[PDB]
Structures are given as C-alpha cells and as structure tokens.
Symmetry: D3
Subunit: 74 residues, 6 copies
Amino acid sequence: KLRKMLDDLLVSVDHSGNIAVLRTPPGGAPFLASFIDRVGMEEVVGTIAGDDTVFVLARDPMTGQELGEFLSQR
Amino acid sequence: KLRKMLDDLLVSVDHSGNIAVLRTPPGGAPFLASFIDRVGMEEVVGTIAGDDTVFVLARDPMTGQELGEFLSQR
Amino acid sequence: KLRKMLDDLLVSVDHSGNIAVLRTPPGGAPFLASFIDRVGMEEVVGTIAGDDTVFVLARDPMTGQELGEFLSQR
Amino acid sequence: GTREKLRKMLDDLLVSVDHSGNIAVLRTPPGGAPFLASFIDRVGMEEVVGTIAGDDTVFVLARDPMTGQELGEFLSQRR
Amino acid sequence: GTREKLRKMLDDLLVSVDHSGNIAVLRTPPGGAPFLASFIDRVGMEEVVGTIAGDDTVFVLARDPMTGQELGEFLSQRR
Amino acid sequence: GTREKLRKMLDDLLVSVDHSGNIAVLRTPPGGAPFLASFIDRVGMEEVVGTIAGDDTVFVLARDPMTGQELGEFLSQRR
Ligand SMILES: N[C@@H](Cc1ccc(O)cc1)C(=O)O
Ligand SMILES: N[C@@H](Cc1ccc(O)cc1)C(=O)O
Ligand SMILES: N[C@@H](Cc1ccc(O)cc1)C(=O)O
Ligand SMILES: N[C@@H](Cc1ccc(O)cc1)C(=O)O
Ligand SMILES: N[C@@H](Cc1ccc(O)cc1)C(=O)O
Ligand SMILES: N[C@@H](Cc1ccc(O)cc1)C(=O)O
C-alpha cells in the first residue's frame, strides 16, 4: 500500500511548476518512487529517484502542487 | 547509434511541459541517457537517469513533447 | 564550502524553465548535489543527481536561469 | 529507538539473506537496497567493514575473521 | 526467449569479464551495469548469490564452492 | 597531471580505508563514492580488478594474489 509506504518514507513534499518533489530518509528515494511507478497513476508522467529526493512529473494541466497534495493526502 | 539504442531500450515516451520522459527496461535508464548525452543535441539541456526512467530537459522554446517525438522518431 | 565544491565540480551550468542543470565530471553529481541540499537554500525546491548531471528545481517565481546564475556566481 | 528501528527496517526490507566467503548478501524489494544499507551503516556494526547498495541487493563485507554467513545470522536474529 | 535474450545482452553489454576469489567482475559501456545485472538477476543463476551494479561495473558473487573465475567462464560461454 | 589529480581526489574524498580479504573499502563524504571510484578506474591500476561505488562507500577488488589491505596501503600512500 502506497498510503503505508508514504507514512514511513515521506519526510516532506514540495513543488514547483509541473513537478512534485518528495523527500525521503537517506537512500529512500528509489524505494518510494518505484512503488509510485507500480501504482500507475495517470497524472504521473514519470518519476526519477535520486538518493533522498523523488521528482514526480505531473501531466498537464495538473500542477506539481496538486499532485503532491494528493500524495501527501495519502 | 542512438537509433539502434532506442529500438532496444525505449519502452515508451511521454512528456509534460519542458520535459520528455523516456521509459526503459529495468536498470536501462543510465545506459540510454548517457548515450543521449554523447550525441550532444543542442535542444537537450540535460538528462538525468533513474533506474527505468530518463528525464530529458528541452531547451526553450522547444517542448518536451516535440523533443520526445524526435527521439521516438529515431 | 559550496564555493570551493563548485570550482572543483561545476563543469557547466544550463537551464530551462524552472530547472537549473549542473554538469560535473564523471560520477560527480551526487557529491555536488548532496552538498547543495545541505546548504538549504530557500529557492531550491529540491535536487536530483544522476551521474554527471544535477537537476535543481527553482521555487516559483525564480527561474532556473536565475538560480543557475547564483550557483555559477559562487 | 535504534534497535526498534533496525528491527522494523529488517522486517520490512529484508526479503532474504545469503552469503559467500566474507560477503553477506541482502535482498530487498525494488529500490530498497540503499534505504536498508544506509540504515545499517548508521547502526555502527563493528563486524561490518562496509556496505554497498545496488537497487535490490546489498553486499555487506564482514570484518576478518567473521564470515559472510555469521554476519547474515546476526542480522537475521535482529528481525 | 530468455536464452536468446541473455545471449544478446551479453554480446551487447559485456565488454570484459574478470575475477578475484569468489567475485566475477563484468565491465560494460557507460551506464550499462544496472541493465546487464538486472537481467542476470532475472535469469536465476543458481551459482550467483547476488549482483551489484555500479555504473559500468558489476560484481557477481559466486556461490560456494564455485569461484569468480568459473562464474565468469559460464557467462563468457553464453555469448 | 594524473598523479597530482589522484593525490587531490584522495586527499579530498578519502575519509578512510579498510579491508577484508580481497576487498579494499573506501569511505567518502556523502555522494562521493562514484566520483572517487570513476577516477580510480581511470588511473588504470593493474592491482584493481574493478570497483563499485555506492553512495559513500567503494569496494575495490584486488587482483590475486594482492590483498584488500595491500591495495588500501597503496592508495593511502598516494595521499
Ligand atoms: N537530493 C539529491 C542529492 C543527493 C545525492 C546523494 C545523497 O546521499 C544525498 C542527496 C538526490 O537525491 O539525488
Ligand atoms: N522510475 C524511477 C523510480 C525507480 C527506482 C528504482 C527502480 O528499480 C524502479 C523505478 C527511477 O527510475 O528513478
Ligand atoms: N546525464 C545523465 C546520464 C548519465 C548516466 C550515467 C553516466 O555514466 C553518464 C551519464 C545522468 O547523469 O543521470
Ligand atoms: N541486483 C543488482 C542489479 C539490479 C540493478 C537495477 C535493478 O532495477 C535491479 C537489479 C543491483 O541491485 O545492483
Ligand atoms: N566502476 C565503478 C565506479 C564508477 C562510477 C561512475 C561512473 O560514471 C563510472 C565508474 C562503478 O561502476 O560504480
Ligand atoms: N554505504 C552504502 C549504503 C548507502 C546508500 C545510500 C546512502 O545515502 C548512504 C549509504 C552505499 O554507499 O551504497
């Protein structure tokens, strides 16, 4: 469950333009991001995970702030 | 040849705003992206590869959709 | 010091839209990016590092060009 | 606390443990290896010389004379 | 099919093979190591305890009593 | 020049060196392991079979019969 992953891994959410930024604990980004990819959300154009940072690309016309609010809401 | 790399590695292309998103098979993103970097395309501001996802940043005024169409066309 | 890291690691800076792109020597991206993260700059929404490429997301209304100019200026 | 945290990390991320020679091999779910390995590093195991995470695999190097197997067992007992 | 795919992977990604002790070391082109290693994991080699990919290098741990060299040879013969 | 560059790399990135068996283990600051390891690869050490970088850790495999320790010492002497 993404909801469960998000309580353990989502340290914070931020945004700018079409991107939602998710912060995780150290090394957490690929574990969280690949789980997002498996959910298969239509508004999620794609994700890239660094070490502690995920960039999630929102499908126009959704903004990165809206997208990040939906992930933070879970 | 990028054309050849793209038939073996490009599972799909997507976009939003100034970003083209390329999906690859598992672990394929850095192999595909670094090969894009070596091509040296003026409209490609840069790329970042995750595991199975490449973000390619299009130079304004080109959009991520146009850029992704040119890569998908190869 | 970020200033010192930037002379050793910043090969070039580029931009498009809300993103500043930093190029590093091979494998340098996570070393440079995590150091940016530790600085904690309010306009930096987040960073993701690939191998030789950092994407830095600028907080609206700052552009990726302005942000990249401030990093290049250090 | 650190121990309760390690135990929960291991329970949620450690799919299996294996070994060969002085290496213990941890398997995780997809993307999980840096998350798990980062934390292991942070607990400060004297018997661990170091770790490297891939995507779903960690190699944990055992400090001589300990073996990869013994390392693995130590970790399994923390679950 | 899996074998034809492994063979093509190896032909296109394996620049060289080397070894030391219980480790086989695969070299790839730039960025190629996770692509190759992911696939190796997926073929299910019983003689492989696990793999870790860097950027252009994979370490493949051989299951005791097999050696890194023997592993390498097995892989070379699949090309 | 390559040597002055290696020396500066090592001085700035090598927090510590350790070993077990045929592996030398390099510790770096955060994110530093691919930067350091890339460069090591590029200097062409005959005694190095290969390297893999994580985030803050590199495993350097020593070419038989050299040991992880001896490798480490060689690198320490370049600082
Ligand atoms: N936040 C960036 C930079 C980073 C890289 C390595 C780290 O250990 C920490 C941060 C990323 O996750 O890609
Ligand atoms: N698509 C993201 C997340 C991801 C990370 C690890 C994976 O194994 C799979 C997907 C990326 O490539 O960075
Ligand atoms: N520039 C991209 C692609 C890349 C990946 C692996 C490399 O070795 C080089 C480049 C990134 O840094 O993610
Ligand atoms: N098991 C290897 C190879 C791998 C790479 C990428 C993957 O998505 C999956 C597996 C590692 O974790 O490095
Ligand atoms: N060979 C090592 C170090 C390396 C890191 C990044 C590179 O781009 C190249 C080499 C690895 O694959 O981890
Ligand atoms: N030391 C391990 C685990 C690790 C992963 C991510 C980190 O940010 C820190 C440590 C490695 O370098 O792979």
